[PDB]
A paper describes a structure:
Universally conserved across the three domains of life, enolase (EC 4.2.1.11) is an essential enzyme that catalyses the dehydration of 2-phospho-d-glycerate to phosphoenol­pyruvate in glycolysis and the reverse reaction in gluconeogenesis. In addition to playing a primary role in metabolism, enolases have evolved an impressive range of ‘moonlighting’ functions. Toxoplasma possesses two enolase isoforms that are differentially expressed in a stage-specific manner. Enolase 2 (TgENO2) has been shown to be specifically expressed in tachyzoites, whereas enolase 1 (TgENO1) is solely expressed in bradyzoites.
An apo TgENO1 crystal structure was determined in space group I4 to 2.75 Å resolution. The crystallographic asymmetric unit contained three nearly identical TgENO1 homodimers. The TgENO1 structure reveals that the two plant-like enolase insertions are located on surface loops. The larger pentapeptide insertion EWGYS forms a short β-strand (β5) between the α3 and α4 helices. The insertion produces a more positively charged surface potential at this N-terminal domain loop. The dipeptide insertion KQ, which is between β11 and β12, also increases the charged surface potential of loop L3 in the C-terminal domain, providing a possible site for binding to ligands that will negatively regulate the catalytic pocket. The interaction of the N-terminal domain of one subunit with the C-terminal domain of the other subunit forms the TgENO1 dimer interface that buries 1891.7 Å2 and contains 33 hydrogen bonds and 15 salt bridges. While key catalytic and ligand-binding residues (TgENO1/human ENO1: His165/159, Glu174/168, Glu217/211, Lys355/345 and Lys406/396) are conserved, TgENO1 exhibits three atypical residues (Glu164, Leu176 and Gln380) in the active-site pocket in comparison to TgENO2 and other enolases. Most notable in the bradyzoite TgENO1 is the presence of Glu164 at a position that is most commonly occupied by a serine in other enolases. However, a comparison of calculated surface electrostatic potentials indicates that the nuclear enolases (hENO1 and TgENO1) tend to have a higher degree of positive potential than the cytoplasmic enolases (hENO2, Streptococcus pneumoniae ENO1).
Residue numbers in the entry:
A (entry chain A): 1 to 444
B (entry chain B): 1 to 447
Write the structure that this text describes.
């Protein structure tokens, strides 16, 4: 039995040089810290983070107002409370102290999702200490999962970039590699790292040294015009690295970015100077293109294949490929219960991309994960473009028994601290853990 | 008081995706962790790392051997010792357990510079805890410096890359910006981040979206042909940010990369295809070229202006710039006492670039810093190309009261990791600390 003795927040910088919020919760057991990744300050479905909007500081991206919220609103309301009452603390902040609710659920507009999550994670971390348990086992406790035979997740490393993250012709946003065939996660990380360096070398020699400079998530943005060229580089790299058959491929289309709202078309050539009518596809036809790549390449997962509001296409694609392939819903679900329930009723997808700061609290993150799992869906915990030194999602993925996680390329320490944390988790557990492997989407 | 109960180590990944060692020293006061950055497994001056060299694991960069060394050689030797005796522990490893050496001091080859530094830093963290002091203050007591009016360092952020780190025409390796005009470290960081983003979008318009991708240290590699083109971008970036006069420039030439041994001349166009742009320059002319830029642009520091062994030039350059510009030694010194002493005698520099894993231990890192400081030189704590999420050098630079630190651009968390740590330290100390500012070369004393 411990209680919240103090709560102080501060402004720190995320992986991209932009301010983010870090919180320190104190109990008789010590000081507990949590740093929140970056999200969206404006939006219609997701939880909005509070930013100063002062052009004279950090180009308007400061979080001082957020720091003051924690001190002036959240602190006085939590002093004396038991940090182990995760649900009580999260619902107090979200429903009572804030209460700002849009038509899709609580927005967390007044206090800001960033201020709330910071406290939620810090209390969650203080609670684990109060119970004398490592973070991963404590999360499992909150989710109703068991603390033995915990599943280590399959990591999804970003490798090739397109869409709005590159000047190349590639329309899809991300191409990743996933070592499902590794015996354990420490090896999974090696397979990933080696294949990644091999790919770097290939790019260095073909596209030049400057093409080996990385993007926000640590991936490369070589001058490839089509998905086929991207997919070809990956298969060559995997084979050359010696992991043919042990490392699979996955991609994030981010189709919303190339969707033509009125005519209801998807323009695979939205970046090309000379436009081709043959590439302005309807949902049903875009589907067939993906189905073409699935039979030709070892693709095991597809994220945001269509616009965030095109449930028709999602449903059709999932109906055709759902059994043997994973269809992740990111922008379409936005880690939102109501959005998920609608997806479930329409069988839009079969996997939830879980961005914790997108929903705002740990309790809400957990219920969303549980809803997906109870419905037969898989769950992939995700990082953000703007991450931090905090490895929370690493313990989260293990505690929620997802057996699946994408947290960037094996490059840039905001991505690696998560992967490093997973390896420590694995040592600690030792024989008391198993690797998701081929069962990443539905762990045993 | 408390003693060492156990020492373990594991293999983690550094910022470039290469393995490195992480050590956990345990006492009754808890478990203390330390991760070391990348170094070099070969060289004739510096402390050498121990790499597995296994053709089939991590391209020969594994560190399982280093991890086993800690377990079978170090651990048994340290169990029961007080973690506070930093010097006793550091010398037990460097001189007795290891003992290997070259004509420039102990190399730390048998146990590995990485295994020893990992242990040294972990114990240092355990010692701080024993004494009941934050790591930075504990380091101050080891260096024999006061813990009352501590000094925050001026940060040197990487911004434009060249030489071997870029396919562009720029011969110099790094260009940095330093907010000497900021009132405190948190402001210095803001100034840096703002100027960095202003630079980012200037580059975006003139070179395109791909040109904004970052290198190992978070900086950019725009296709600029000369130093003049690079300096103009920085001047422009600084003015757009509104910090003209408050943010100065610095650069690391890494001149060794463009020195022609056979000719004994430097080539600023060594990357150009056609090789007749301009004749190669001697130390003399190269100096004049730098002095030329010192008048043109607000450059306050120059690192590795000449070849790793060209003391004649260094001396000549340091002599006529003297009090108005900082001249850092990196490759020429390689954080080696005996090298520092030769450079001191020859007046080759007026500042030391301190790379803690290059010398091997915290104790040696401290005497190196103390040797520089008491001889009229500055000390600039530095990061490595391959960093980790360990913010140790943040507390080191504060504890040593250096007044200056380079730890990458305000991009990539292995870099922000250190900058964020400096801001926490500043909060902790509150009204009980000062910003080096204008005095970054030699922080003013307290009275």
């Amino acid at each position: 039995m411990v209680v919240i003795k103090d709560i102080v927040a501060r402004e720190i910088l995320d992986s991209r040089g932009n301010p983010t919020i870090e919180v320190d919760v104190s109990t008789e057991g010590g000081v507990f810290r949590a740093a929140v990744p970056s999200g969206a300050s404006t939006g219609i479905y997701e939880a909005l983070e509070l930013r100063d909007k002062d052009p004279k500081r950090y180009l308007g991206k400061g979080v001082l107002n957020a720091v003051e919220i924690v001190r002036q609103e959240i602190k006085p309301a939590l002093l004396g409370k038991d940090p182990c009452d995760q649900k009580g603390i999260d619902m107090l902040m979200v429903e009572q102290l804030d209460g700002t609710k849009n038509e899709w659920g609580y927005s967390k507009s007044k206090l800001g999702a960033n201020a709330i999550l910071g406290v939620s994670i810090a209390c969650c971390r203080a609670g684990a200490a109060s119970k004398g348990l490592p973070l991963y086992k404590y999360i499992a406790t909150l989710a109703g999962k068991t603390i033995d035979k915990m599943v280590m997740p399959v990591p999804f490393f970003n490798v090739i970039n397109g869409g709005e993250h590159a000047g190349n012709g590639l329309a899809l946003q991300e191409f990743l590699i996933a070592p499902v065939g590794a015996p354990n996660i420490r090896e999974a990380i090696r397979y990933g790292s080696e294949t990644y360096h091999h790919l770097k070398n290939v790019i260095k020699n073909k596209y030049g040294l400057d093409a080996t400079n990385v993007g926000d998530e640590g991936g490369f943005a070589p001058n490839v015009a089509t998905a086929e060229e991207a997919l070809n580089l990956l298969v060559e790299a995997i084979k050359a690295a010696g992991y043919e058959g042990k490392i699979k491929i996955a991609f994030d289309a981010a189709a919303s970015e190339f969707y033509k709202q009125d005519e209801k078309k998807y323009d695979l050539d939205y970046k090309c100077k000379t436009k081709n009518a043959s590439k302005h596809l309807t949902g049903e036809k875009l589907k067939e293109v993906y189905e073409g790549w699935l039979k030709k390449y070892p693709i095991i997962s597809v994220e945001d294949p269509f616009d965030q509001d095109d449930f028709a296409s999602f449903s059709a694609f999932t109906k055709d490929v759902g059994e043997k392939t994973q269809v992740i819903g990111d922008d379409i679900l936005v880690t939102n219960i109501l959005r998920i329930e609608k997806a479930l009723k329409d069988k839009a997808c079969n996997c939830l991309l879980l961005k914790v700061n997108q929903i705002g609290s740990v309790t809400e993150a957990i219920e969303a994960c549980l809803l997906a799992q109870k419905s037969g869906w898989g769950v992939q915990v995700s990082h953000r473009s703007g991450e931090t030194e905090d490895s929370f999602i690493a313990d989260l993925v293990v505690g929620l028994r997802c057996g699946q996680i994408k947290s960037g390329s094996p490059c840039r320490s905001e991505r690696l601290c998560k992967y490093n944390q997973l390896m420590r988790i694995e040592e600690s557990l030792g024989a008391d853990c198993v690797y998701a492997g081929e069962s990443f989407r539905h762990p045993k």
